[PDB]
Amino acid sequence: QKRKLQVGDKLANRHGNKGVVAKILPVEDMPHLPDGTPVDVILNPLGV
Amino acid sequence: ITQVRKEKKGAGLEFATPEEALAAHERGEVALNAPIKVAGRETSVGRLKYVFANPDEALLAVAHGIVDLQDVVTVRYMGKRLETSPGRILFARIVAEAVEDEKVAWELIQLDV
Amino acid sequence: FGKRKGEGFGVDKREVEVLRRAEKLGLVTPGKTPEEQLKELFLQGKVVL
Amino acid sequence: LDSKLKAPVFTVRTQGREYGEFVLEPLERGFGVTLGNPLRRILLSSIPGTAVTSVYIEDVLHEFSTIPGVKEDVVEIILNLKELVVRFLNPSLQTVTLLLKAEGPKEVKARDFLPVADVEIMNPDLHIATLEEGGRLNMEVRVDRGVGYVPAEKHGIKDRINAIPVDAVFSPVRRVAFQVEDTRLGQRTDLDKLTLRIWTDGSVTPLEALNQAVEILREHLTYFSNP
Amino acid sequence: SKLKAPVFTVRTQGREYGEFVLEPLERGFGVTLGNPLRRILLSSIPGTAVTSVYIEDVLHEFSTIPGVKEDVVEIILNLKELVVRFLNPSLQTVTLLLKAEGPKEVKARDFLPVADVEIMNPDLHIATLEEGGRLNMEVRVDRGVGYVPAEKHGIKDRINAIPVDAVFSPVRRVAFQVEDTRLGQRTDLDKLTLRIWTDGSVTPLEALNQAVEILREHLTYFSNPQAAAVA
Ligand SMILES: [Mg+2]
Ligand SMILES: [Mg+2]
């Protein structure tokens, strides 16, 4: 089976920041740079 | 949204007539939210410059970029002249609409913090 | 940025508003041009979004 | 892949001329805020209305002064004049000057203003000021057509030397609130439901305001036609 | 003091890129017009994508082909980047055929030409074929809108065919600039510039036009009010 990332799957970085994907927004709902480039992932600063 | 601005530009200057305060603010000598003294009372330029007849007008002014939510200002709410931010008025209205009682909601909140 | 300046585009209104907000936050030095301030923010790793 | 759209149904719920609720469902994913945001922006800024732009009061130099014989200060009176809802019946009319002369132990209302051709006061029971014995109030107020919100020191208009510029609230719309909730049609999961809430002063109805709001937007879309 | 119809400027580079200016516009209308268009341009603009792949002697996606460097998964990944333009509006589907062999690097150019169908990126790499390496493919490309994963559409032309994730949107990127402008004695007005990048399937101007059409049609939905029976 080929498994695409879905809501409830678990992500982490090398620094101990871990979390479960709670939402997947369409590209037009994503925060973007002035040149139109949208961000991939939004991490809450409260976790730092 | 409920925090207020504290600015160092004015730095507690003394003014006689409020129009001198407005003029000084226009020259860039005194910041909007910087504490100053007009006459004997301590106040800020913002409380003078912008005086709203009701919350709706204040938030409408916020929508047009006239003032931010953290700017200390003057608003007429429930027959009272209040020196406060549009943000705290907004909070008050959030509570009031949530509980559907305006008087009680006014009594429950601490507005000045 | 320089790419943008070459493409014929100036600083955005919203970018200016954000620069005002950032100016109040002590992130940039008041009096500098929009580009200089955007560079200061970018050097802090922050961008307009 | 293969898609079939039923198309949306518009639902209206109104209380008087002051308030209304607008529900548009179902909508394709994302179109909830795509429609709702411009409409809100337009409804606040671009809707034509009237406002008091200037006030002159006899023997009153500036805004922070006080009025002998009257209990309210100038500041409070100006506020009361901001809440005046004035409607222009004739589309031609740009501006009106309303005069008010009263004295003695009386409470001045919006009814007291001398009637002008094709000018209707929606709120005649609005309180302006209270006068005591010997109290005298002579005032002229400037009422203009316009849109949005203009501070007093922006338009900066004076008919005479003692005329006080007033922050001009043109917008008949007091507030706009919209909320997009997820909804489902059959097995379609992510479809949008747009709920719109519009508060006006009664000079324009919420439904009229919205209809005017969409028309402005539609008209702007036609600007992409001829290069 | 009412603003009137603004000048609309158009700048194009090939079929890939475009800039669309509107000036002057009333304050705050740069965003009001610009943003919904970007939201519609990134989502609702119809286009073409490969919906299916069949390779001879390949039963599924998880298999490798003798003489070929890339596994089927990578091959399909490459085929997801294939940009196919339909000249005829009436045509909803096309099956491209690819027959290749011997040592060579098979690109998207190697597909057999079909009437009223143009490949916008003929240099796109598909596979690396070795001596005796042999590749026979049939790829189904459809018209569609948005993003439909393979699991949702499940399109199979034949038994051993593999459903492909389809990104239908022709629009690669959308940005908009709002700059300070003035007309006469008016100040703080808006100059709106829409920057549009597409894949060539449809031109940025076409995209802008059908986006505007979509928004207008949506505005039509307010034409028929209904009383609320909740009371
Ligand atoms: Mg003022
Ligand atoms: Mg209290």
> Using CA atoms, how far apart are residues E139 and E94, in angstroms rounded to an integer?
8
Chain D positions in Cβ-Cβ contact with residue B56 (cut-off 8 Å): 174-175, 199
> Using CA atoms, how far apart are residues C7 and E17, in angstroms rounded to an integer?
13
Pairing of strands B14-15, B35-38: parallel
The distance of B52 to chain D (nearest Cα, Å) reads 7
E187: Cβ–Cβ under 8 A, 6 or more apart, which residues?
A: none
CA E176, E179, E184: angle at the middle one, nearest 5?
A: 135
In a domain? residue E214: yes
Q: How far is the CA of E211 from the centre of ligand 1 (A)?
A: 43
> Using CA atoms, how far apart are residues E20 and E205, in angstroms rounded to an integer?
8
Quick check: bond before E24 cis, omega within 30?
yes
Give the residue from chain E lying closest to D2, CA to CA. Answer: E144
Chain A positions in Cβ-Cβ contact with residue C4 (cut-off 8 Å): 34-35
By Cβ distance, the residue of A26, A34, A36 closest to E174 is A36
CATH code for the domain of D183: 3.30.1360.10
Q: Is the torsion defined by CA of B102, B105, B110, B111 positive or negative?
A: negative
**Amino acid at the residue E112:** L
The distance of A43 to chain D (nearest Cα, Å) reads 22
| B57 part of contact set with chain D, CB < 8 Å | yes
Quick check: bond before D115 cis, omega within 30?
no
Work out the end-to-end distance of chain B between its first and last CA atoms, rounded to an integer number of angstroms: 11
Give the residue from chain C lying closest to A39, CA to CA. Answer: C49
- What are E59-63's contacts with CB under 8 Å, separation 24+? E59/E160, E60/E160, E60/E162, E61/A2, E61/E162
Do D42 and D65 have their domain in common? no
> Using CA atoms, how far apart are residues E193 and A42, in angstroms rounded to an integer?
28
Rg (alpha carbons) of chain C, rounded to whole number: 10
Do E51 and E164 have their domain in common? yes
D89: Cβ–Cβ under 8 A, 6 or more apart, which residues?
A: D118, D119, D120
Q: Which single residue is written with the structure tokens 């051993």?
A: E160
> Using CA atoms, how far apart are residues D48 and E170, in angstroms rounded to an integer?
40
Q: Helix (H, G, I), strand (E, B), or coil: what is residue D143?
A: strand
CA D205 remoteness from chain centre: 10
By Cβ distance, the residue of E43, E61, E195 closest to A28 is E43
**Residue D69 backbone dihedrals phi, psi, to 5 degrees:** 95, -10
Q: Are E201 and E120 in contact (CB under 8 A)?
A: yes
Look at A4 and E175 and tell me if their CB atoms are within 8 Å. no
Do E97 and E162 have their domain in common? yes
Q: Are E204 and E190 in contact (CB under 8 A)?
A: no
Chain A residues whose C-beta sits inside 8 Å of any chain E C-beta: 2, 4, 26-28, 32, 34-37
**Domain limits at D86?**
49-170
Chain breaks in chain D (C to N over 2.5 A) after: none
- Residue D141 structure tokens: 């107020």
> Using CA atoms, how far apart are residues E72 and E60, in angstroms rounded to an integer?
8
Do D102 and D179 have their domain in common? no
Do D107 and D146 have their domain in common? yes
In a domain? residue E143: yes
**Amino acid at the residue E67:** G
Q: Helix (H, G, I), strand (E, B), or coil: what is residue E164?
A: coil
B67 DSSP β-pair partners: none
Select from D125, D149, D170 the last residue of a domain. D170
Do E118 and E101 have their domain in common? yes
In a domain? residue E231: no
Q: How far is the CA of D164 from the centre of ligand 1 (A)?
A: 10
- For helices D206-221 and D31-45, give the axis angle rounded to 10 degrees: 110
Select from D155, D170, D185 the last residue of a domain. D170
Do E52 and E158 have their domain in common? yes
Q: How far is the CA of B103 from the centre of ligand 2 (A)?
A: 9
Q: Which helix (H) or strand (E) holds E207?
A: helix E204-219
Do E68 and E156 have their domain in common? yes
- Half-sphere exposure (Cβ direction) of E203: Cα atoms closer than 13 Å: 13
Work out the end-to-end distance of chain C between its first and last CA atoms, rounded to an integer number of angstroms: 14
Do D9 and D40 have their domain in common? yes
Q: Is the torsion defined by CA of D151, D152, D156, D158 positive or negative?
A: positive
| Residue D203 exposed, middle or buried by CB count within 10 Å (0-12, 13-18, 19+) | buried
Q: Which single residue is written with the structure tokens 């589309």?
A: D91
Strands (E), D44-188: 48-57, 86-88, 95-103, 106-109, 119-121, 127-131, 136-147, 149-150, 164-165, 168-169, 173-182
CA E29 remoteness from chain centre: 27
In a domain? residue E229: no
> Using CA atoms, how far apart are residues D64 and D66, in angstroms rounded to an integer?
7
E153: Cβ–Cβ under 8 A, 6 or more apart, which residues?
A: D1, E51, E163, E166
Of the ligands numbered here, which is closest to the C-alpha atom of B80? 2
CATH code for the domain of E113: 2.170.120.12
State chain C's maximal CA–CA distance in angstroms: 31
Q: Which is nearest to D8 in space by CA: D192, D213, D196?
A: D192
By Cβ distance, the residue of B17, B22, B64 closest to D149 is B64
Domain count, chain D: 2
Q: Which of A30, A32, A35, A39 to mutate to test the interface with C (most CBs of C within 10 A)?
A: A35
Q: Are D64 and D74 in contact (CB under 8 A)?
A: yes
DSSP state of B44: E
Select from D170, D189, D210 the last residue of a domain. D170
Q: For chain B, list the domains and their CATH numbers.
A: 1-113 (1.10.274.100)
Pairing of strands E147-148, E166-167: antiparallel
Q: Which is nearest to E4 in space by CA: E141, E129, E172, E186?
A: E186
D11 DSSP β-pair partners: D23
- Residue D209 structure tokens: 């305001």
- Half-sphere exposure (Cβ direction) of D28: Cα atoms closer than 13 Å: 19
Do E218 and E162 have their domain in common? no
Do D69 and D162 have their domain in common? yes
Strands (E), E14-46: 17-25
Q: Are E166 and D1 in contact (CB under 8 A)?
A: yes
Q: How far is the CA of B47 from the centre of ligand 1 (A)?
A: 9
Do E146 and E203 have their domain in common? no
Chain E positions in Cβ-Cβ contact with residue D227 (cut-off 8 Å): 8-10
DSSP letters spanning B87-110 = HHHHHHHHHHHHHT-HHHHHHHS-
Left if phi > 0, otherwise alpha if psi is -120 to 50, otherwise beta: which for B33? alpha
In a domain? residue E69: yes
Q: Are B12 and B44 in contact (CB under 8 A)?
A: no
Q: Which helix (H) or strand (E) holds E181?
A: strand E171-183
Length of chain D: 227
E136 DSSP β-pair partners: E99
